Amino acid sequence: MYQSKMNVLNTEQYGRAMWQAYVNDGENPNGNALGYAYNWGYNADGNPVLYGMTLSKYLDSKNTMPVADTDWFDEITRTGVIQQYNLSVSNGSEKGSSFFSLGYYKNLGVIKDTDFDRFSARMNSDYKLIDDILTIGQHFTLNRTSEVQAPGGIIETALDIPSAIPVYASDGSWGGPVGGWPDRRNPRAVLEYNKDNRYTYWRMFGDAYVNLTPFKGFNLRSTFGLDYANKQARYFTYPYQEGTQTNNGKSAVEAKQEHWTKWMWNAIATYQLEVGKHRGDVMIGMELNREDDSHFSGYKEDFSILTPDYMWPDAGSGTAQAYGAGEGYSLVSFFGKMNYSYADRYLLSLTLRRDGSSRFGKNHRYATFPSVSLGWRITQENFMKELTWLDDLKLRASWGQTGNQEISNLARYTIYAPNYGTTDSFGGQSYGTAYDITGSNGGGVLPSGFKRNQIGNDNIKWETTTQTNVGIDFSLFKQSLYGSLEYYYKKATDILTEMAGVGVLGEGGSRWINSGAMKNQGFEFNLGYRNKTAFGLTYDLNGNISTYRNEILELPETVAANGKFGGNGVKSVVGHTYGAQVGYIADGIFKSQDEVDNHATQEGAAVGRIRYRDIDHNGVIDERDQNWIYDPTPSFSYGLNIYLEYKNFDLTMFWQGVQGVDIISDVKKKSDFWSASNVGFLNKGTRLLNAWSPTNPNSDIPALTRSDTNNEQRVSTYFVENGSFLKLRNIQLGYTVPAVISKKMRMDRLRFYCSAQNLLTIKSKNFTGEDPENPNFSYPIPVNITFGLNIGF
Amino acid sequence: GKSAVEAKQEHWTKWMWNAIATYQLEVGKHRGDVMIGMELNREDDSHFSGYKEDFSILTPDYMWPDAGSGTAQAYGAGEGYSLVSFFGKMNYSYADRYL
Amino acid sequence: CDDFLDRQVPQGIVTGDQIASPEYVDNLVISAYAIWATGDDINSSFSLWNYDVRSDDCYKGGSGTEDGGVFNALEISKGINTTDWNINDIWKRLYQCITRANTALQSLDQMDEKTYPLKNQRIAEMRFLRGHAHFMLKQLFKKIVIVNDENMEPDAYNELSNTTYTNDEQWQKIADDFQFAYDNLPEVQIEKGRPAQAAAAAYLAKTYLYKAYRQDGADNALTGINEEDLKQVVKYTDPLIMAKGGYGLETDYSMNFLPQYENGAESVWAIQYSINDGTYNGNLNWGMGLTTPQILGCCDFHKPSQNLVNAFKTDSQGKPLFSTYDNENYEVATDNVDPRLFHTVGMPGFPYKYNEGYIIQKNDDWSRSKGLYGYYVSLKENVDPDCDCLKKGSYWASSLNHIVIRYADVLLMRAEALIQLNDGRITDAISLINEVRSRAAGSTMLIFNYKEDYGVNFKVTPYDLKAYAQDEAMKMLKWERRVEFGMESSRFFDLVRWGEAKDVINAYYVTEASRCSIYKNAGFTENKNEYLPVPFEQISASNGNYTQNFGWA
Amino acid sequence: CDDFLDRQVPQGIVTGDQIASPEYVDNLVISAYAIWATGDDINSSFSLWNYDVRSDDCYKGGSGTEDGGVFNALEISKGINTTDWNINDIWKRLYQCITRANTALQSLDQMDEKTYPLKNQRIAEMRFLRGHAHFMLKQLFKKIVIVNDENMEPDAYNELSNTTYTNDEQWQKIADDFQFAYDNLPEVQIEKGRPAQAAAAAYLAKTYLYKAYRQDGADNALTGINEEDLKQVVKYTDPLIMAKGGYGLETDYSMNFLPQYENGAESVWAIQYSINDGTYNGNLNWGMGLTTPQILGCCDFHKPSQNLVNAFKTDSQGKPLFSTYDNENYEVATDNVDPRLFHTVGMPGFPYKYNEGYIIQKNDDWSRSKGLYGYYVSLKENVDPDCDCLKKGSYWASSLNHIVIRYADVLLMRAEALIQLNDGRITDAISLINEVRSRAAGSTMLIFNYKEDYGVNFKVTPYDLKAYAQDEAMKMLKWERRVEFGMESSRFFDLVRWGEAKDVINAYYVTEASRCSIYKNAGFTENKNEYLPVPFEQISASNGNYTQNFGWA
Ligand SMILES: [Mg+2]
Ligand SMILES: [Mg+2]
Ligand SMILES: [Mg+2]
């Protein structure tokens, strides 16, 4: 259940706000285009005060759309309900084993006209031939999934559409905007039109292996793996005509198909050996990987009968389009490991891996990665005999490299695509290569060509991350006070990004490149305390607090002024943290004209506007009056886990926190401005009604206005907020039924649990959004209550 | 100079369910077996394709619908059927002499 | 296990090392034409209609001020920010046009004339297109980057500047492209999308015309009118060139803006928007999407100004009311008026694009803003709602060709160069004005019965042929540009070319504000608002290689 | 577990109980037009070209005798079997045309005129189409089943006969359909696929014309020419009817068979073959597939006869060589000739469909049979190989409309009724012949320079206007039919309507055999070969309800 949401204006508040923004601009508020009539005037000090307002019964002169106070968020949401059932059975026998599971999972989502279900079956087994020198086995699982996904941004568009538009027209048809109201369709009606777009997803993945043990410590193992999934769906387009919103009479169906087959193979040889004190393990291996993908669809317009039963491509009468493509990649992997321990006192492990990937040219295809890990168990040492309050004190130190390779399969190519212009696109922007070069005006295949999607890179290589951590884990008393203190230093080199191109280079200038170096070093320190009370209670309290600081070290000169990694194109983020931002500094609100003249000259400066600071003291506010105003690095992040057992009950709480952290958001452009938006008359947040006014002089929120002359949409501390938080991820209580009563039923264990996710959140007072951990959203994560059982025979 | 590619897809899902109850019994000479049952059956089929003409490079690597420049056609349909089945049997043998 | 890492090949594409192949060169050529239809969107129309809202011809329209407020800033010249997404977009989008023109040029450079005899013709076609895009960037930004090396590798684009060339040398580099087109395009192009030699001449003249009004100062003020630049305008508007490709005035003015009448003798070069063409919804002119009237449900952008409407009045013997036209608003009953009005702006009481089944009204049905932006409609790019050329996608659009160069523009540009030369060929310049002005008075083919049905008193007359002082001549030329090219998105560029953009736009601001309240706080600042700022994001990525415009840093 | 047996519903179709719904009635109407384009194939063309091979106008063509030998039997009248698949197919295919016309009629019968005012117009359209199909069946088989009850249920089709009506009553039932069309079709059809009132009149006249030559005996011999049936031909060829729909002769004869010139004033009703239309390869005239010349690789069927070529000669003052035309073969140099020849048959030495880039030659390139079937090509349904209307599927085809009724046919059918009435309106009948014959002599628009380039001596003159005896008049009318309608697949039907089919086809057999060896054993048997046998498979399935034709059992 969605607990809260950004409160948006109702039909009267929306009418009040637009009035304020009108009189704030010295404009006749009764000349609005939306049918509000305002009874107003000036007070004793000569300042606009709104006395009353009326609204038509209908929004349009033809009386097809009645005036409403719709709460759109409540209209497209509901209580989600989830139900899972899993039944498993396993069989252990001298010469083999086998396992079998059936599961079902059904989600009716919190969003109307959505749902999701997963049948699943797993079946694994092993067979001891040549008893304990030659073993054969298998794992396999099988999933069928089917779902109607919500449309993208359905929630936000429900907060965007004004409350005056009704859900239903005067007859029973879908409501919509008339006249000047926003060119945004009915979100409920969009869901209903989406309700039949259901995909069916089948996935199988398993593996078969042979394990040969030729003498005592030796092992040869080969494994073959397979992961094949396919998704199928029809996406239905139905006509609509709801006020000014219109499809004309469009109808179509797209029958989409997708395939992903992934196979894997490995061989591995391991040898273990033990001589009194010395223990040693060696291991070598290899792993080939391949994945092949393909998708394709059929689209066709115009259908006599607007039902899924009727609407197959065979039945369409309008035009058709055919889509589809494929991609793939392969991976070779050679690796080895060496473990050694002197007296369970000194550990040493070495590791070496060559990875090759078809996403790079032959000249960078493989990269080699080593590691050294070292260990000293202090308390085992002889001189540590005297400290009885110290069960363990291990000291580990590591150094290793790993690679990043997650990039496009065509990252290295200059790609020309035919792109005739057969795919939908918004408001233009087909970038089709077809043109009426003859002047015909159409009615046939046009001549066409090729356009560039990206420029290749003959020198694209692996991103390499070198990592170093030293650790101290411990336990004192009699395993009642366990803890660990770690220190890590990860540094990434030749970071991979799809990086766009300069403007003058034009179409398809995007490039996949290796670009610079980062550094991330920090401190982790977990501590625990477990102990029973001898009064019937066990507690097990496990904490964690971490800190980290991040910093960019090198960057190509072109990328640093670009601003991909931070700095907003005005300052280089080198020596700063990844994602930090430069912007203007919001210094409050001009409250008098004298305060406007008494400030560096800035264009939109007026009473009620935002005063922006003159960082360099030249007497004007321009593009240089910016500095560092946002750092995502939290000062620290913590987590505490409480576990209690008492009279067979058990109680669990998981808390996680983040303290002293900047967040940055656009939310405030919807909540704090009538006009901080490219499209007009959208619904806005309720913070507007405390906007600045002569009647309302001591407020952080600038005066409502129909025009953003002051560019208050500029990157500024107005959008930076204290995003510190602390929340209960999970609380859970359960009863375990004592075996005295449970084995009554020829059943070992029988347990009932009740659990809750995302229930509580404690935010900063000067945070004004919904959820500080996800500051971009105007809605929180919904709470989950669950009831469950774990019967066990 | 025709060139085209048709990307065809077909699906057949068939599921089945039954319940069956059997009872056997032996009294000296007489042996008898009874059995009752039921079986629901369903099959759902669907196919569909995309066709497109005119390709600059006459190779499978190149010839996907995205890459075609001529006209397109879209095909596809589905059909299905369901079966219900109730049944019973009765076996009897007197002296392994009369069945 | 290395043969294994090479097996998978890109699917459905051509790679960079195969695309210069001869078999694809004409594909690349078509592709460069294609982006003139497919490379814009509703906020970035290659007609530049979005930015001509600065001019005294139009309002922004839409629901109100909040609807594209970034374009309200432009329309009142206050609140424009260097960071604005629309400025950055139009800069980005026209340089994408140049990419395809150059990519083809790079391949065309490698062909053998002996085996490909259309080489120089196709090369001419591509530099024409390259000129068209640089020309528009130049109108928009003044300080443009000249991207005219097609063999330049991707890394050298990082070191380009918009100050490598002086203002005059930039105009020359645009002219040099058009020059090559003139010397190499054929006289007739059966395939009418391709420009003919006369189209190149006409664009070459247009660019030497704009280059003539020098801004060789550090700012935007005029530093003279260069004689020899004008003499190139005269040379390439030569009627003997235009005759050789068949170009001429249409017998009725309306024919330039009607689907039935595409590619007539007055369409010197046009963008061939098309329908029923294999594309997802037609290569329609999606860029005009916002311009359709409210009677289609949306969106009612690009609305004519009461000023422009008034500019069509005439003076009892058929001439502009030069100093009085805008004192009183037009009254069909008592006022003489110019026929071009009824092909430019749709007024209430009169048929929308000649279809008496749709009579415009002072209605919530015809103005999304309930009167804020008035009640006038732009005809020249809309069509009969009953046209078979009209389709809906995200927005309503049509297959109506967009004429980049109308033959009237050749005639009036020729007269402008003659007036401004002052060699006693002013009379020649007035008979060219007369050619354009006479056609107007006869263009009642589609509205002949408005005297009876509505009381319109048409009267337009040619000018008496005699000696005119030059400022008087210019006054008549400017005015003929006004009534011939309204809502064709050239008005503001003229005003800037003439160096009087601050004066008349400001006067218009005070003048229009009484009728339309968005202008109540308007204000054009000289030596700043004549051009768009170069986009902050573009300056940022250059590493100090681009410089901003005067008045912007 | 019975809710379970009902869940699955047909996908992608409409079921029989929903298809009579109003929302689909215009769909059914279009569907009945559609089958005239989509319901035939290469061996069953709705032009009936395949069966006009029996006539003295054409040979079968193709590789040789073995190529469609079933059509060699027809062409020589020997070896035709009642079982032949082609006869059965053409019978089956035209009754499928009637199915769609009736299915729409069944739905149209249930509409309310008050709510659907085009009801009777649409009904008229459907009975027209129903007449067209019965008419062709009647020409082909004489003893047809009259399927004109649209409310008849599927089982009642098993008890129908082709002898429920006498020969004369069958013709009347076809006329009754056309009669309703005349009384209800509009005078103009903006949508040119739909027949106009004059098209109905013209077809009504054509059917009363064929009905006039009575075969009321038990056999195919003529039993008289009925006066009142002729008087209906005169009534419905009335120029005052034809004027009201705008129909008239084209100023050049070639225009009836050129893509540039579809739906002219002489195309009274035509089949609207189309291209770039959403269908898999275009609604082209696939039925003419076999007719294209060898220069396209295949297949060289439907070749003009040396007889027909010779029929175009003229007599030093511009008239047919009535009794001498075929003695010597045409020699372009020394002979006068009729311009229609060069629009009918392509001869060697001359441009194929007016394209001097393809000159026909006595070549393996131009006759698949290396001389067996001569070297002549049918122009009227082929096109310029450079046409944009020509596409390849299984066979080469085009979007060239097939004209079912040419306005010349109205004029000549009118003259035929007048000659055969003999009310001293014979002169009227000759001035109508003259209208058609004068147009021919002026139809050199596309071949005016053949006197210079090849030495063609055009001469065609009208007839002196005076009294003519009736057999002399008929002789001139038949001849004008010959040179006007060659290779339009009406020649044999005329010959049968006139009752002289055995006489002239046999004479032609002896005459043509010296030039083409397939006729060496030919032989038409009277009172048998005038019509196709009713297909054995059709008689078989009737359970004794159909009777065969005279001479066939
Ligand atoms: Mg400053
Ligand atoms: Mg066009
Ligand atoms: Mg046609």
Numbering used by the authors:
A (entry chain B): 224 to 1016
B (entry chain B): 472 to 570
C (entry chain A), D (entry chain A): 1 to 553
What text appears in the publication on this structure?
For the levan utilisation system, the cell surface components are Bt1760 (a GH32 endo-levanase), Bt1761 (a surface glycan-binding protein; SGBP), Bt1762 (SusD) and Bt1763 (SusC)15,19,24. SusC proteins are unique among TBDTs in that they are tightly associated with a SusD substrate-binding lipoprotein15–17. Recently, we showed that SusCD complexes mediate substrate uptake via a “pedal bin” mechanism. The SusC transporter forms the barrel of the bin, while SusD sits on top of the barrel, opening and closing like a lid to facilitate substrate binding.
Next, we obtained a structure without a substrate using a protein preparation that did not suffer from proteolysis. Interestingly, while this structure is very similar to that reported earlier, density for the plug domain is poor but clearly present, suggesting mobility or different conformations of the plug within the barrel. While there is no density supporting this notion, it is also possible that the plug has been ejected from some of the Bt1763 barrels in the crystal. Consistent with the relatively high solvent content of the crystals (~63%), there are large spaces underneath the barrels that could contain ejected and mobile plug domains. Superposition of the crystal structures of plug-less and complete transporters indeed show non-uniform displacements of up to ~2–2.5 Å for Cα atoms of barrel wall residues, which is substantially more than the coordinate errors of the structures (~0.5 Å), showing that the barrels have subtly different shapes. The very similar crystal structures of Bt1762-63 in the absence and presence of FOS appear at odds with the dynamics proposed in the pedal bin transport model, but are likely explained by the fact that crystallisation selects for compact, stable states.
